[PDB]
Design a protein around this ligand. Structure first.
Ligand SMILES: *[C@@H]1O[C@H](CO)[C@@H](O)[C@H](O)[C@H]1NC(C)=O
Lengths: 49, 49
């Protein structure tokens, strides 16, 4: 199947939650250029936090 | 002589040399900082903002 396996109740839990431990990585990757307007986590990450 | 309200070349370059896409240092309209110019189209600004 492949090791990316949540569950369905885990999906319902994990779709209403923006900043989980994978949303943080995929939002921190998005700081090279902004590319829509801006982000808040990029302003945090470029300030040491 | 050397004192008054009629100033001669005391103001800086104020060039129209916007360097897009790169990380630079800026002071436009009073606000200092280190960032990026990046061209885009948007129209919620007014002619006094
Ligand atoms: C990252 O950026 C891309 C394009 O800029 C966008 O499609 C995507 O939704 C962004 N993801 C996050 C988590 O901000």
């Amino acid at each position: 199947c492949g090791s990316s396996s949540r569950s369905l109740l885990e999906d319902l839990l994990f779709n209403k939650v923006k900043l989980s431990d994978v949303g943080f990585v995929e939002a921190y990757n998005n700081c090279t250029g902004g590319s829509e307007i801006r982000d808040l986590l990029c302003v945090q990450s470029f300030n040491g936090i | 002589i050397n004192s008054g309200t009629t100033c001669s070349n005391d103001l800086l370059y104020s060039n129209t040399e916007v360097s897009t896409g790169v990380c630079v240092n800026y002071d436009l309209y009073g606000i200092t900082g280190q960032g990026i110019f990046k061209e885009v189209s948007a129209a919620y600004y007014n002619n006094w903002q």
